[PDB]
Structure 1
Amino acid sequence: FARPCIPKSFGYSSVVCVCNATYCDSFPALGTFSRYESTRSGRRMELSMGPIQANHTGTGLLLTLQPEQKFQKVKGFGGAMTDAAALNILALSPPAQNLLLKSYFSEEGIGYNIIRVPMASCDFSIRTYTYADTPDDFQLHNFSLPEEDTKLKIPLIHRALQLAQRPVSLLASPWTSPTWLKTNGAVNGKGSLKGQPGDIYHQTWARYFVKFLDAYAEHKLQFWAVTAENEPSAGLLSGYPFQCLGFTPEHQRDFIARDLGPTLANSTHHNVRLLMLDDQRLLLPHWAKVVLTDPEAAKYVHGIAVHWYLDFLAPAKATLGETHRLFPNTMLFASEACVGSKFWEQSVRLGSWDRGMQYSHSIITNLLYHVVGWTDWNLALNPEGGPNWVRNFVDSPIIVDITKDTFYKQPMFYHLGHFSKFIPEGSQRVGLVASQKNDLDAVALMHPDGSAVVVVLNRSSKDVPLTIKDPAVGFLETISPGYSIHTYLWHRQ
């Protein structure tokens, strides 16, 4: 049954939806379309229908589908299961925990199909650890998963998979290696692996990845992909305040070529995809050129992961678009995003419409430039945006209010849902052209069954009447209200 949003305002531009132990909000014909609408004024994925008409006339804005122009296939959408997300979720009563996970992972919720999992601690942990902290354990004999994995992350990831109808892909990323493998002997700061790729430090580090995949397999979890390192550029930066491990693109190239690729290929986990970069898109296309023009590294790289944080410095055509033109067979994937990280921003703005529009504007732009997936950061945080051992607080689509056993679903959650619920793995992006200049962001995709989905974000405050033309089925006449977001679905059969 469709239970509606319980709105609550916290003084910002829109409302959150209040969920608790007993209550959370939840969820065509032919010649007919469905519309799902979310507005700043408070509408939350509201369903409505309309006719696909045969003829159309007028000089209004027209968006024409080009279903014969086929682009990338979609891997999917989801978020990260950090220690911080696990702690917050486990601090609710079990019925409330089930409503939180169902929100994300079930068909009654928004159908996430990706989960990013940090390999040992990052800033969103309450302590500083790796899986092999015993000094000079080159053998990795004292390699083990702490309670953070065995009592927190793993059981939650299981509950998620149990609630999913869609098959879920796990993605793993390390922030730092054991400190005895690092030039600087610390989890943070400027510092990289000692020595040079091909050597004992590097074979050990590669072996750790396999050790990690082995331990997760023992608990019956398998990975779709790993990244070669979270934000390699970080550890190049003097003073870096939290867990990091620096690689120049050359160093990453040679690590993948001589150590990490071979070690994964020779393992039971040879089907695991390796993704490179896992950093700002401004580093593209340079990094892809350095890594992929080496045939010894190229043969191990399935794809390129990007983070959104310096987007403003890096227009998508010159970065994502140029990477696709040079390397069309190496998928681009967005693996981390969050709002509220800028020193001047308040970490959590409960009910922020603006932050929701940032998510959807990013997903659309990324999809228009060949990106196959998009992953949020922390699945849930507290009202302060934590916890986080260095107070690097940020926002999250779900905020958990522990002392009240309630959690808030923010507009980011819905802007995300507009994609994740209606764009399953295997969907494919198709062309869409606009009849004239406009302030909308729009993308069209084809489901595996051939049915259409179109998402329209209105970045301006003015209501925009428009028409969507599907070349051999008809016309959808609709209105896109100011600031709103719409998903349209229709069968082309």
Structure 2
Amino acid sequence: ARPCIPKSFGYSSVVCVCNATYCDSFDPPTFPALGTFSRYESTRSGRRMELSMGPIQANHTGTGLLLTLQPEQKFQKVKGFGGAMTDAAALNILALSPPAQNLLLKSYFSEEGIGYNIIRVPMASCDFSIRTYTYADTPDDFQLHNFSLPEEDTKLKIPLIHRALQLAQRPVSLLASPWTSPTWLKTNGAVNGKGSLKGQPGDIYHQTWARYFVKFLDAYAEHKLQFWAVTAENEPSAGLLSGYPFQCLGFTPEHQRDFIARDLGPTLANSTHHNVRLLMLDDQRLLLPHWAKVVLTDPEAAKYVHGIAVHWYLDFLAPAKATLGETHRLFPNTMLFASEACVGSKFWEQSVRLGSWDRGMQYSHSIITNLLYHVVGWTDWNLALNPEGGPNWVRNFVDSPIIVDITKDTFYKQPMFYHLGHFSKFIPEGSQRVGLVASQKNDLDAVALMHPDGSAVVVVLNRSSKDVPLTIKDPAVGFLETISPGYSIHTYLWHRQ
């Protein structure tokens, strides 16, 4: 339909400019006959998921790298891709005029955008809020009679979620994570800093906190929203660090184990929301496999845990094989799910870099690595931020695939938006990762999957400056002759039948 309006802000590539009356979008998906492939291409030089087609031929013209599909080697099935409807994201979106808001939401959730099917929802406030609050700040309310949803939920988050779901083609799954409990449940009486639940698993504080999960699910269900899963705590390890600056609730692995076993698991099971899944960890994968060993070798905890949620912030010092791979080896029937990523929260990282191709590459590289190590899904952090990377009440300003400049009723789609979209748009839920064999050492990152209808999708990322000639072989169709340019990402799709 409408192409990208490029704009440069002095970094390595361009953003795409959208306003109240214009945003770049796709035509409805349409895919060609057997023997033809579809290629979507994004480049640092400015191409943004541009579509072209070509032949899959019986003859093998290329003499360079060959990537050979191996559809009989089957791995994990995919849950999906998405981002977080934080307070900061919803404030930025709702400060656009309504027509602009819809172009933003369609960008993420529609088939004319990139088909997100996962939304992470914080349970009350986190750093990406403009104030500190929980749903039950009234102290010594252990039956949670004064549990209530504030304006952030009822006015910002929930209406936007409702609109995302209306616009979405695919069913969207909601995932909830709490940052802090009511402070009168905490050893330190504060929203942040080093503190855990008071007492011990099974007691009144732990039972009240588990009841808080049910109260949250009831509240959202009253607004006609139901959750696929919750996490046992966002970044539980952070709450063990002296002086941690934002909302946290510390658990040791043993404390998470016992809380799930004694309190959260049974309470969820004894509730009308017993079908909601429980994900453990929700933290840096450096904590793996140890956290998995502690929780999952206890059968009274393990029976309640559906999967393990990981954050990407320490991926660089923890190789995937030693963490995701060793965890899948030890517990092959517990899914791994990437529940949060963002660029710009480390020091030295300037918060927002509009047009940064480098930060787009970081996203796709991470997604490819996750997929090659059994991860079933990948979830961005804030869906939208302002040009400073906020709001954020502790000024932990970070980057986001969409940056909203409300003073101009304008938002910018970063290279991160398109690098994610090379996956989210073309790997529907239930797709299965299959083998892809490289014929020789190379600089590319690639992954192959099969849609539920048996058709093929391959993503090829080139992080090097050099053009790499490439052949992709499907044993049942033939040879796809192409080139992966320097600083590019491609998604290929083709029927196999």
**TM superposition score normalised by structure 2:** 0.98
- Alpha-carbon distance, 1:281 to partner: 0.4
Equivalent residue, structure 2, for 1:351: 355
Once residues 376 and 286 of structure 1 are traced to their aligned partners in structure 2, the CA distance between those partners, rounded to angstroms, is 25
Equivalent residue, structure 1, for 2:217: 213
Contact 2:61–2:481 (CA under 8 A) maintained in structure 1? no
How big is each residue's C-alpha offset from its partner over 1:128-159, in whole Å with a ceiling of 9 and x where there is no partner?
00000001111101000000000000000000
How big is each residue's C-alpha offset from its partner over 1:318-355, in whole Å with a ceiling of 9 and x where there is no partner?
10011111111100000000001112111000000000
How big is each residue's C-alpha offset from its partner over 1:50-82, in whole Å with a ceiling of 9 and x where there is no partner?
100112155410001110000000000000000
How big is each residue's C-alpha offset from its partner over 1:381-409, in whole Å with a ceiling of 9 and x where there is no partner?
00000000010000000000000000000
Once residues 316 and 395 of structure 1 are traced to their aligned partners in structure 2, the CA distance between those partners, rounded to angstroms, is 24
How big is each residue's C-alpha offset from its partner over 1:361-381, in whole Å with a ceiling of 9 and x where there is no partner?
000000000000000000000
Equivalent residue, structure 2, for 1:483: 487
Q: Secondary structure at the match of 2:57?
A: coil
- Alpha-carbon distance, 1:412 to partner: 0.2
How big is each residue's C-alpha offset from its partner over 1:197-228, in whole Å with a ceiling of 9 and x where there is no partner?
11110000000000000000000000000000
Once residues 72 and 270 of structure 1 are traced to their aligned partners in structure 2, the CA distance between those partners, rounded to angstroms, is 25
Once residues 324 and 350 of structure 1 are traced to their aligned partners in structure 2, the CA distance between those partners, rounded to angstroms, is 37
- Alpha-carbon distance, 1:433 to partner: 1.0
Q: Secondary structure at the match of 2:473?
A: strand
- Alpha-carbon distance, 1:30 to partner: 2.1
Once residues 429 and 393 of structure 1 are traced to their aligned partners in structure 2, the CA distance between those partners, rounded to angstroms, is 35
How big is each residue's C-alpha offset from its partner over 1:438-475, in whole Å with a ceiling of 9 and x where there is no partner?
10000000000000000000010000001001112101
Q: Secondary structure at the match of 1:52?
A: strand
Once residues 486 and 451 of structure 1 are traced to their aligned partners in structure 2, the CA distance between those partners, rounded to angstroms, is 17
Once residues 88 and 61 of structure 1 are traced to their aligned partners in structure 2, the CA distance between those partners, rounded to angstroms, is 45
Equivalent residue, structure 1, for 2:8: 9
Once residues 139 and 472 of structure 1 are traced to their aligned partners in structure 2, the CA distance between those partners, rounded to angstroms, is 62
- Alpha-carbon distance, 1:89 to partner: 0.2
Change in 2 beyond 3 A, CA 1:115/1:438:
same
Once residues 315 and 263 of structure 1 are traced to their aligned partners in structure 2, the CA distance between those partners, rounded to angstroms, is 36
- Alpha-carbon distance, 1:300 to partner: 0.3
Equivalent residue, structure 2, for 1:118: 122
Q: Secondary structure at the match of 1:55?
A: coil
Once residues 243 and 30 of structure 1 are traced to their aligned partners in structure 2, the CA distance between those partners, rounded to angstroms, is 53
Once residues 25 and 57 of structure 1 are traced to their aligned partners in structure 2, the CA distance between those partners, rounded to angstroms, is 36
Q: Secondary structure at the match of 2:103?
A: helix
Contact 2:62–2:470 (CA under 8 A) maintained in structure 1? no
**TM superposition score normalised by structure 1:** 0.99
Equivalent residue, structure 2, for 1:372: 376
Asked if 1:302 is matched to 2:302, the reply is no
Once residues 288 and 48 of structure 1 are traced to their aligned partners in structure 2, the CA distance between those partners, rounded to angstroms, is 44
Once residues 28 and 167 of structure 1 are traced to their aligned partners in structure 2, the CA distance between those partners, rounded to angstroms, is 25
Q: Secondary structure at the match of 2:174?
A: strand
Q: Secondary structure at the match of 2:140?
A: coil
Once residues 124 and 148 of structure 1 are traced to their aligned partners in structure 2, the CA distance between those partners, rounded to angstroms, is 12
- Alpha-carbon distance, 1:102 to partner: 0.2
How big is each residue's C-alpha offset from its partner over 1:13-55, in whole Å with a ceiling of 9 and x where there is no partner?
0000000000000092221000000000000000000100112
Once residues 401 and 300 of structure 2 are traced to their aligned partners in structure 1, the CA distance between those partners, rounded to angstroms, is 40
Q: Secondary structure at the match of 1:268?
A: coil
Once residues 55 and 408 of structure 1 are traced to their aligned partners in structure 2, the CA distance between those partners, rounded to angstroms, is 43
Once residues 481 and 59 of structure 1 are traced to their aligned partners in structure 2, the CA distance between those partners, rounded to angstroms, is 16
- Alpha-carbon distance, 1:313 to partner: 1.2
Once residues 22 and 28 of structure 1 are traced to their aligned partners in structure 2, the CA distance between those partners, rounded to angstroms, is 31
Once residues 30 and 66 of structure 1 are traced to their aligned partners in structure 2, the CA distance between those partners, rounded to angstroms, is 18
Change in 2 beyond 3 A, CA 1:58/1:396:
closer
How big is each residue's C-alpha offset from its partner over 1:113-132, in whole Å with a ceiling of 9 and x where there is no partner?
00000000000000000000
How big is each residue's C-alpha offset from its partner over 1:74-129, in whole Å with a ceiling of 9 and x where there is no partner?
00000000000000000000000000000000111000000000000000000000
Contact 2:62–2:471 (CA under 8 A) maintained in structure 1? no
- Alpha-carbon distance, 1:483 to partner: 1.0
Contact 2:62–2:469 (CA under 8 A) maintained in structure 1? no
Contact 2:62–2:481 (CA under 8 A) maintained in structure 1? no
Once residues 306 and 346 of structure 2 are traced to their aligned partners in structure 1, the CA distance between those partners, rounded to angstroms, is 32
Once residues 243 and 316 of structure 2 are traced to their aligned partners in structure 1, the CA distance between those partners, rounded to angstroms, is 24
Contact 2:17–2:411 (CA under 8 A) maintained in structure 1? yes
Equivalent residue, structure 1, for 2:105: 101
- The runs of 5 or more residues in structure 1 that have no matched partner are none
Q: Secondary structure at the match of 1:415?
A: helix
Q: Secondary structure at the match of 1:204?
A: helix
Once residues 261 and 152 of structure 2 are traced to their aligned partners in structure 1, the CA distance between those partners, rounded to angstroms, is 32
2:207 is aligned, of 195, 203, 208, to 203
Q: Secondary structure at the match of 1:301?
A: coil
Change in 2 beyond 3 A, CA 1:394/1:201:
same
- The runs of 5 or more residues in structure 2 that have no matched partner are 26-30
Equivalent residue, structure 2, for 1:249: 253
Contact 2:455–2:495 (CA under 8 A) maintained in structure 1? yes
Once residues 55 and 46 of structure 1 are traced to their aligned partners in structure 2, the CA distance between those partners, rounded to angstroms, is 26
Once residues 18 and 57 of structure 1 are traced to their aligned partners in structure 2, the CA distance between those partners, rounded to angstroms, is 40
Q: Secondary structure at the match of 2:244?
A: coil
Once residues 322 and 374 of structure 2 are traced to their aligned partners in structure 1, the CA distance between those partners, rounded to angstroms, is 13
1:30 is aligned, of 15, 26, 34, to 34
2:445 is aligned, of 441, 447, 452, to 441
Once residues 84 and 468 of structure 2 are traced to their aligned partners in structure 1, the CA distance between those partners, rounded to angstroms, is 35
Which consecutive segments of 4 or more residues in structure 1 shift more than 3 A?
none
